[PDB]
């Protein structure tokens, strides 16, 4: 810790001087501070390999310390010649983040192909190191492998393929409604534009028609309760059947009419807890709003031992309509 400090002290003083130095000289003191830095990084590598296992916390804290220095020796060599980078990258034979950004600053897509040619899992490293950060679109062509899939799939004219992943990303989608809607639309336009047999196509667009059928529900949410509930227009999440059924029936939804409940009884097959507790919850606010007309209609829209009764009252025209509701069902 004094031996080492006196070396990181003359790196920085060998950095201040090449700022004013005849060309050739500034290189020989650079091949030198590369000769010296490659003996420090070799001694921290040999001490690592010396210690292992238990008390690991101390062995993964000394890694971060040598890794913040092969980064401070790399940046330092970012101004310097990269002809030495190849040897600094090999000396601490990984420190790839530095030799990977030297291959990026130049047109050597030949070097980043020569790097991955002789490497152990650099490919899984150069793609995750491109995403964290022209010919960069040829590396974008390979980096578009993963969810960005559909993109390079439209490009490759692999439409059917684009449709499968576009639907897959539509399904996992929960964070943004406006986006779950966009992906299906794209998936659909992908599939339609693709080369399915009229049979397969008819399946993709039917299994699809289903998705659009559930969505349409959250889609038709009245504009009275969405400013009441102070909701973002599009910047809202993909709601589930429950939230929907319960929101279509809120006392906030003021103009709630036959269609609001009919659709709040259509979203019961969209569940996967208590079914017939809600079946009641909703038919009951279907009457609170009546102010004892709508119950009337929703029994007219259904076309029946779904609804309950004695359980319900848990009253003069409830039974009265439940008589010409035993004649209707019959």
Q: Angle at CA 76, nearest 5°, toward 30 and 116?
A: 95
State yes or no: residue 69 binds another protein (CB under 8 A). no
State yes or no: residue 181 binds another protein (CB under 8 A). yes
Residue 174 sits at φ, ψ, to 5 deg, of: -140, -20
CB 175, CB 237: distance < 8 Å: yes
With CB under 8 A as the contact rule, which of the stretches 47-55, 119-127, 171-179, 274-282 interacts with another protein? 171-179
State yes or no: residue 301 binds another protein (CB under 8 A). no
Site size toward another protein, by CB under 8 A: 23
State yes or no: residue 179 binds another protein (CB under 8 A). yes
- For tokens 């060599």, name the residue: 77
State yes or no: residue 151 binds another protein (CB under 8 A). yes
Within residues 190-229, the interface with another protein by CB under 8 A covers 190, 192-193, 209, 212
With CB under 8 A as the contact rule, which of the stretches 45-53, 109-117, 177-185, 285-293 interacts with another protein? 177-185
Nearest Cα neighbor of 143 from 154, 128, 153 is 128
CA distance 47 to 83: 28
State yes or no: residue 158 binds another protein (CB under 8 A). no
CB 91, CB 38: distance < 8 Å: yes
Q: Which is nearer to another protein, 14 or 221 (CB)?
A: 221
Within residues 128-147, the interface with another protein by CB under 8 A covers none
Residue 308 sits at φ, ψ, to 5 deg, of: -100, -165
Beta-carbon contacts of 284 under 8 Å, excluding residues fewer than 6 positions away, are: 312
| Residue from the set 182, 240, 294, 312 that interacts with another protein by CB under 8 A | 182
CB 175, CB 166: distance < 8 Å: no
With the C-alpha atoms ordered 217, 219, 221, 226, is the resulting torsion angle positive or negative? positive
Q: Which is nearer to another protein, 32 or 178 (CB)?
A: 178
What residues line the site for another protein (CB under 8 A)?
148, 150-151, 154-155, 157, 159, 175-176, 179, 181-186, 188-190, 192-193, 209, 212
């Amino acid at each position: 810790r004094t031996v080492i400090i006196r070396q990181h002290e003359i790196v920085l003083k060998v950095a201040y001087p090449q700022a004013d130095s005849n060309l050739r000289n500034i290189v020989t003191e650079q091949l030198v501070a590369l000769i010296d830095c490659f003996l420090d990084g070799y001694v921290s590598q040999l001490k690592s390999v010396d210690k292992s296992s238990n008390r690991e916390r101390y062995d993964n804290l000394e890694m971060e310390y040598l890794q913040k220095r092969s980064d401070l020796l790399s940046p330092l060599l970012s101004l310097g010649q990269y002809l030495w980078a190849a040897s600094l990258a090999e000396k601490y034979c990984d420190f790839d983040i530095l030799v990977q950004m030297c291959e990026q600053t130049d047109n050597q897509s030949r070097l980043q192909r020569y790097m991955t040619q002789f490497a152990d899992q650099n490919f899984s490293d150069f793609l995750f190191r491109w995403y964290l950060e022209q010919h960069g679109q040829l590396a974008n062509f390979l980096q578009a492998h993963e969810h960005l899939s559909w993109l390079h799939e439209i490009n490759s004219q692999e439409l059917e393929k684009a449709h499968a992943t576009l639907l897959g990303l539509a399904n996992m989608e929960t964070r943004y409604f406006a986006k779950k809607k966009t992906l299906l639309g794209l998936s659909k336009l992908a599939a339609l534009a693709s080369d399915f047999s009229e049979d397969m196509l008819q399946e993709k667009i039917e299994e699809m028609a289903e998705q659009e059928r559930f969505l349409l529900h959250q889609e038709t949410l009245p504009e009275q309760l969405l400013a009441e509930k102070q909701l973002n227009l599009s910047a809202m999440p993909v709601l589930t059947a429950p939230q929907l059924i319960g929101l279509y029936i809120c006392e906030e939804n003021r103009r709630a009419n036959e269609y609001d409940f009919k659709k709040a009884l259509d979203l019961l097959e969209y569940i996967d807890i208590n079914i017939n507790d809600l079946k009641l919850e909703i038919l009951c606010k279907a009457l609170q709003r009546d102010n004892w007309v709508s119950k009337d209609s929703i029994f007219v829209k259904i076309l029946l031992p779904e609804v309950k009764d004695l359980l319900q009252a848990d009253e003069f025209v409830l039974k009265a309509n439940y008589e010409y509701y035993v004649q209707g069902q019959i």
